[PDB]
Every structure is written in C-alpha cells, then in structure tokens.
C-alpha cells in the first residue's frame, strides 16, 4: 500500500510545577509532525506556529466562549485530572530489584565486565554507582541508560569494566525515591 | 517541571484510524477502544480509582477527522513523509534458564502510526500470550510502541521481532538468544 497518508494530531498538555501550585496548559494541533497552531495558557489566546495555522488562530480567537474554556483549563482540566490520578501516578513508587553478574566484553576472553542490573523500578529518576573495596570507581563505567518497559516500570544496566582480582569486593549502590537509604549488592571474585 | 499529563489524539487517512489516550510522564494511563467504545486502563488497578466517559473520546476523534480533511485541503494535499522505526529487543529482567521471563520489542521514533509486528520463535510466527500497547506519543511528535512475549528461556530457542513499516524497504528483524 503506497497510497499517501495524512495525519492529524492533537495534544492537550498539562504541565505541573511544585504540585499544583504552578500549572501550564497547552492546546496543540499538528499536521503530520508539524505543530501549526497552539493555545498557551501563558498567553490566553491561540497563536499560529506555522503559516498553516493562521486561519485557525484567527477563527478560534474570535470565539470568546471557546477561549474562556481554554483559559479555565488549568483549573477545570489540569488541576482536576491531577487530583483524579495522583494516588497512582504522582505517588507511584516501586523499588528496583538489583542483581550483579559477571560478563564479557568479547566472547573468548575471561570475565572483564561486571553488570549491575536494576529492574522494575518507578519512577525513572535513579542513581547507580560502582565501588571497589569501598571506594567509588568512576572509570570504565558504561550503561544502557534509562530503559522504559512500557508497563510503568523502568530498568537499567550499569556495567563496570574491570579485571576482578581475588579478594576484591565490588559493590553496586542504588539510590531511588522509593528507597529510604541506598540499596547495595556485593559481588566477590 | 515535575509532571506532565498529555491527552494525545490522532486521526489518519485513508486508513480511517483514530486513537485517543492519556500520558503521564511518558507512560500511558489509558486509551479508548474506539470500536468497543470502552476505556482500557494500562494497569487494571488504575480503573479501581478512576473512571473515564469513553464517549467524549469519540466526539474528539470525529472533530479530528473533520479537521484532517480541512487541513489536508489547506496543505494542497501534501502527504506525510515516512519515518522508519528503530527496533530494540530486550528482556524485562536478567535471563536464567527455565525461569519465566518476558521479551520486549520496542518500536520507536516512527511515523505514520501503522506497523505490522510479528514475534518469531525459530523462524516461526508465535502468538500465544503476546500483548501490545497502542501507539504512544513522542515529544518530537513521532510514535513508539511496545510488544510483549512471555517465554521460557532455553538454549534451544532463538527469537526475532519482525517489524514492517512503509518507511522500510524490507522487514526489520531484531534478534534475541540466550547468553
């Protein structure tokens, strides 16, 4: 099917700062990927983003009832919906499960990679650090970065390139809003 | 900002496909099954605490359909440019032999929101236990999507996620196997 496609998108966005103390509402209209017109609560009127949206900006701004609907949205829409969903979104907290296992940078070689696998956590904000015998190791650290699982959980792998020596104790340390103190997992060669 | 809530909608011609969903910080709260006229909560727990009148989504989609016609005309019928997806396959937890796990196929950074996705086990299509999300919005106004396959890890099985999209010359296969 090579027939041309045409896409319309609309995004009604509520941005929250300091709980519901400061709120911004954006009514955004898109053709394909191009935003062409928007209502910004900071302004209180529609503004064309591209030439394509000028007729809409002018038509919609001539409708006082419509504008007042949009101007009240921060309260009747944004603050309202925040209240509705807050207990299971804003307040959602799930600790991570943490596993440490050895790996290889190249298949043939001895173990030269320590993987700290951090799984199933929410929200996304997390700090993972490596320690060798109680001293933080900041060199040779590579990660997958933050991975969304699509099901309201995240994961990340944080790897330390190192050649483990007998006696050494490595520690992966994880800090996260769901935790009240750092979570640590040790690995010994 | 601390949090963002987005009500994201689209309508696509000539497919006549329309979607309506809510996003919280990049995760889906719910979408509306347009055909069933029903609210589908992303986690079942969500629906014990909140409700949504699905009919309102229907009304919005109707406006979007009418709006698309006008805009299409205004643009002198300029069509969308295909943007092919990036595809990644991963497991949701570290893999252990015969310990139940889930394969995730992440389809990202693409438009229009139309894709054919197939899970393959040893080169054969599998559908048992599979699930998927609707099209999820990106801040660059492309889309992303997740497909899932629960599985029992073994040395004997290999997997692929196969993705077809109009921006691709051939289907994209991303492989996964044990160790």
């Amino acid at each position: 099917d090579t027939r041309p496609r045409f896409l319309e998108q609309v995004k009604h966005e509520c941005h929250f700062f300091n709980g519901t103390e400061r709120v911004r509402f954006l009514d955004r209209y898109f053709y394909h990927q191009e935003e062409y017109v928007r209502f910004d609560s900071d302004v209180g009127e529609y503004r064309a983003v591209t030439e394509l949206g000028r007729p809409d900006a002018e038509y919609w701004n001539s409708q006082k009832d419509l504008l007042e609907q949009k101007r009240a949205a921060v309260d009747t829409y944004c603050r309202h919906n925040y209240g509705v969903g807050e207990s299971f979104t804003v307040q959602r907290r799930v600790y991570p499960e943490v596993t440490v296992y050895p790996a290889k940078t190249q298949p043939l070689q001895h173990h030269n990679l320590l993987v700290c696998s951090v799984n199933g956590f929410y929200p996304g904000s997390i700090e993972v650090r490596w320690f060798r015998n109680g001293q933080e190791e900041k060199t040779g650290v590579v990660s997958t970065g933050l991975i969304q699982n699509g099901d309201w959980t995240f994961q990340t792998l944080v790897m330390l390139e190192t050649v483990p020596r007998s006696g050494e104790v490595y520690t992966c340390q994880v800090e996260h809003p769901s935790l009240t103190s750092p979570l640590t997992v040790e690995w010994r060669a | 900002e601390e949090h963002v809530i987005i009500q994201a909608e689209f309508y696509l011609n000539p497919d006549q496909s329309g979607e309506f969903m809510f996003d919280f910080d990049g995760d889906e709260i719910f979408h509306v099954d347009m055909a069933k006229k029903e609210t589908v909560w992303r986690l079942e727990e969500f629906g014990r605490f909140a409700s949504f009148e699905a009919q309102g989504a229907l009304a919005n989609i109707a406006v979007d359909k009418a709006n698309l016609e006008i805009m299409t005309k205004r643009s002198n019928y300029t069509p969308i440019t295909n943007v092919p997806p990036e595809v990644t396959v991963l497991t949701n937890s570290p893999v252990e032999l015969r310990e139940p796990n889930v394969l995730i196929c992440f389809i990202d950074k693409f438009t229009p929101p139309v894709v054919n996705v197939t899970w393959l086990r040893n080169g054969k299509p599998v559908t048992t236990g599979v699930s998927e999300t609707v099209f999820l919005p990106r801040e660059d106004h492309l889309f992303r999507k997740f497909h899932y396959l629960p599985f029992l890890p073994s040395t004997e099985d290999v997997y692929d996620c196969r993705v077809e999209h109009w921006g691709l010359d051939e289907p994209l296969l991303k492989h996964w196997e044990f160790d």
Partner: peptide, 13 residues
C-alpha cells in the same frame, strides 16, 4: 474521580 476531556476545537469550512 472522573477524568475530564479537554475538547478539540473545530476549524472553519
């Protein structure tokens, strides 16, 4: 609680 729907504005013509 009930989620509220922001509506989508209808364009001219």
């Amino acid at each position: 609680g009930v989620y509220a729907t922001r509506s989508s504005a209808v364009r001219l013509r």
